Amino acid sequence: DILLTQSPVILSVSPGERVSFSCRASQSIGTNIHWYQQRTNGSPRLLIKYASESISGIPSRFSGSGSGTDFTLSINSVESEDIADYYCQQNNNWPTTFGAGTKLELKRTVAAPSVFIFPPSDEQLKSGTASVVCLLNNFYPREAKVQWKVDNALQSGNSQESVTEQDSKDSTYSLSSTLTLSKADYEKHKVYACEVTHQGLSSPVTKSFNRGA
Amino acid sequence: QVQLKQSGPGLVQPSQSLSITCTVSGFSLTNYGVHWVRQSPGKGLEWLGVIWSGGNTDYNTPFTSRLSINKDNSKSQVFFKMNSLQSNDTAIYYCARALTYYDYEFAYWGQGTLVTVSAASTKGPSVFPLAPSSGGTAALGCLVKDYFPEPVTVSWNSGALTSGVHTFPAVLQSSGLYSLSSVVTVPSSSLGTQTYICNVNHKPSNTKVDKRVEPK
Amino acid sequence: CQFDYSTRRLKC
Ligand SMILES: *[C@@H]1O[C@H](CO)[C@@H](O)[C@H](O)[C@H]1NC(C)=O
């Protein structure tokens, strides 16, 4: 099988810059390469066929070139909606094979998160479990720390984080941190607090509530 | 309007078989071949096979023995079946159509079918409100907890509310069950006027839940 | 990087 090597592994650029994806084939394949874009939760989207030929409905800023073993996909001016993974495909040689992909990330100005804290609903407490949720909304860059404290006791190992992919409009991230306790432990304490550290904040920001109100 | 719609996601036991239906529209199966591609953590995008216009099939070498593709032209359906699934066969499976009847330039894709190979049981989720308690902007959401397998879809107000919606990736809990939250920011002055409902669908368990989220 | 079937994105 033909081995397609895509470089680099991750591409980080700023809006408006030109950007080039590379696809190198293990042997000459002429111009029999196709490019695909995959957005978050999407199916692959055909961008370029046969190294350079255009595809109906694809913005003109996408273009391709190359022949033999070295191929290039270009975006002459990347937009925030181009945030995606990009794959090449060869079909000069059965069976058709795909490269491993290049992830395109977009830089932008630092944006501090907006922090919200959610107590567990009375409905969940009937099931004997308490989920406390801390939301960090629309921030950049991705790195962030969430520190949980229950009655000033530092929580460790009993929380989980989930981070969205870069937003297609403003290029920010959002983060959820879920602290999971048992109902018995939750009813034994009053002050629940998440402290958020981020580059866009001059000081750590703490959102807290008292069980009850 | 060429479209490919696949059957829903589901759980398959180890060593059991997988079945997926691809219903096409905007073209006839007698004029175009339908390809099958999967996308896994182990091997990324992987071409599996194809059933051509006349009914012939080609299978990629490592699937010659456990792959089978059929179709019904009149009903515009293509049937994908793979035997002896193992854990690393967990992937998203697509049907695809090329630009021409003979080529491999995949211009049209199905929406994908997440197939999970696991011995576990299917379990529908519980949905709990993230009730709003800064700067006129209130945040609220839904906690979709304790389901298996992936995926679950969340919309807001039956698709009418999309602005400011974040649906976080599912995370695996120690129980072997998934959990996620879906949030949205709204004007706080609309909490007493507008209703906010998250529409949760866990197709693997046929669980459909609408959760109204209110200030507590 | 590795494909993540939850988000259909490469996770590195
Ligand atoms: C699954 O495991 C088998 C056994 O080694 C291997 O041959 C195959 O390539 C694997 N498939 C993946 C990782 O998608």
Side-chain angles (χ1 to χ4, degrees), chain A residues 1-168 170-213, chain B residues 2-216, chain C:
Chain A
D1 289 15
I2 305 296
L3 183 59
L4 297 177
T5 300
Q6 295 191 236
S7 78
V9 167
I10 300 181
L11 258 173
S12 187
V13 295
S14 299
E17 295 184 353
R18 198 170 170 85
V19 62
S20 295
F21 308 87
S22 196
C23 177
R24 286 181 174 84
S26 52
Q27 67 218 45
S28 179
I29 57 175
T31 54
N32 215 293
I33 211 78
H34 315 305
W35 289 95
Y36 296 86
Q37 172 191 82
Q38 181 164 43
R39 287 177 180 160
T40 299
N41 297 134
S43 294
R45 174 199 188 190
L46 179 61
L47 295 173
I48 291 289
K49 68 181 181 174
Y50 290 96
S52 60
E53 303 177 358
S54 291
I55 297 304
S56 158
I58 300 307
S60 68
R61 66 180 179 275
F62 288 96
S63 71
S65 61
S67 59
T69 58
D70 195 344
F71 303 89
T72 306
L73 175 70
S74 289
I75 316 177
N76 59 19
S77 185
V78 69
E79 302 178 355
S80 58
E81 298 80 12
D82 298 333
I83 294 168
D85 306 317
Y86 294 86
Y87 298 89
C88 57
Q89 170 202 15
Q90 72 83 22
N91 191 40
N92 197 77
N93 192 277
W94 194 98
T96 180
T97 53
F98 297 83
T102 290
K103 177 163 179 162
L104 177 61
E105 300 175 347
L106 258 182
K107 295 165 173 294
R108 59 148 293 160
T109 59
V110 172
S114 310
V115 189
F116 308 85
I117 186 171
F118 297 93
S121 76
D122 291 330
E123 296 88 332
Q124 183 185 18
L125 300 176
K126 291 184 178 180
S127 72
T129 301
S131 290
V132 194
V133 178
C134 187
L135 166 64
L136 288 59
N137 209 38
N138 297 338
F139 59 91
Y140 188 85
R142 197 182 196 262
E143 154 68 15
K145 296 297 190 68
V146 171
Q147 165 181 283
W148 284 100
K149 273 193 177 183
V150 177
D151 279 344
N152 219 78
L154 170 65
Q155 302 305 292
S156 186
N158 54 348
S159 65
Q160 292 187 291
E161 279 179 9
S162 188
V163 185
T164 59
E165 297 287 349
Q166 259 186 302
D167 181 270
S168 63
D170 61 28
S171 304
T172 67
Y173 303 92
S174 286
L175 184 150
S176 76
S177 181
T178 308
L179 173 78
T180 302
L181 311 167
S182 64
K183 187 197 176 181
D185 179 28
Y186 175 75
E187 303 293 345
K188 278 183 175 205
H189 301 280
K190 174 171 165 172
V191 179
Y192 293 84
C194 59
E195 191 192 70
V196 171
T197 300
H198 186 267
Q199 173 181 339
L201 297 170
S202 50
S203 307
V205 164
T206 301
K207 285 295 187 285
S208 56
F209 66 89
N210 299 330
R211 180 183 43 77
Chain B
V2 171
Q3 295 177 0
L4 293 83
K5 297 180 177 182
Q6 310 184 211
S7 53
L11 181 62
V12 168
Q13 296 296 301
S15 80
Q16 299 292 76
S17 64
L18 167 59
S19 290
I20 301 178
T21 298
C22 184
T23 312
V24 314
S25 60
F27 70 97
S28 175
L29 292 180
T30 61
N31 296 323
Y32 290 88
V34 173
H35 297 250
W36 287 87
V37 181
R38 77 173 177 179
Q39 197 168 16
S40 61
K43 292 189 292 185
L45 283 172
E46 193 171 16
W47 180 82
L48 303 173
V50 55
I51 182 165
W52 299 105
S53 304
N56 290 333
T57 45
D58 292 322
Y59 303 144
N60 199 342
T61 301
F63 309 98
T64 290
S65 58
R66 61 201 197 102
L67 193 43
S68 171
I69 308 177
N70 295 95
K71 70 173 174 171
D72 186 323
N73 286 327
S74 61
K75 287 144 72 78
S76 300
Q77 295 177 325
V78 181
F79 305 110
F80 174 96
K81 194 192 177 190
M82 178 173 288
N83 302 123
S84 314
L85 268 67
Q86 305 299 332
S87 273
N88 78 346
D89 291 316
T90 294
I92 296 161
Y93 292 73
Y94 313 88
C95 51
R97 201 209 90 174
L99 210 45
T100 56
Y101 75 87
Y102 59 89
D103 223 324
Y104 292 69
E105 36 190 3
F106 302 136
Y108 312 92
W109 294 68
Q111 85 275 24
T113 299
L114 173 52
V115 179
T116 300
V117 184
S118 177
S121 299
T122 302
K123 185 172 183 301
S126 304
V127 187
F128 304 118
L130 297 167
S133 63
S134 185
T137 294
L140 59 97
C142 281
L143 176 57
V144 185
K145 201 172 185 305
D146 292 332
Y147 66 94
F148 192 85
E150 275 269 271
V152 59
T153 69
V154 178
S155 62
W156 284 88
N157 293 352
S158 305
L161 180 55
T162 57
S163 175
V165 172
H166 295 299
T167 297
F168 292 103
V171 305
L172 189 63
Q173 308 165 97
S174 64
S175 59
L177 304 175
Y178 286 95
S179 179
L180 67 75
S181 291
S182 182
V183 297
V184 56
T185 46
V186 296
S188 59
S189 57
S190 70
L191 292 172
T193 313
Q194 306 291 319
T195 73
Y196 296 101
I197 296 183
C198 68
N199 318 100
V200 178
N201 198 350
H202 187 244
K203 278 181 155 79
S205 69
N206 301 130
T207 306
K208 227 169 136 195
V209 173
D210 288 340
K211 187 74 191 184
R212 169 80 173 268
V213 182
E214 300 184 337
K216 189 173 64 183
Chain C
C1 299
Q2 221 191 213
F3 177 77
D4 178 10
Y5 58 74
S6 281
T7 62
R8 308 197 179 180
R9 294 297 310 281
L10 295 171
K11 191 169 181 59
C12 331

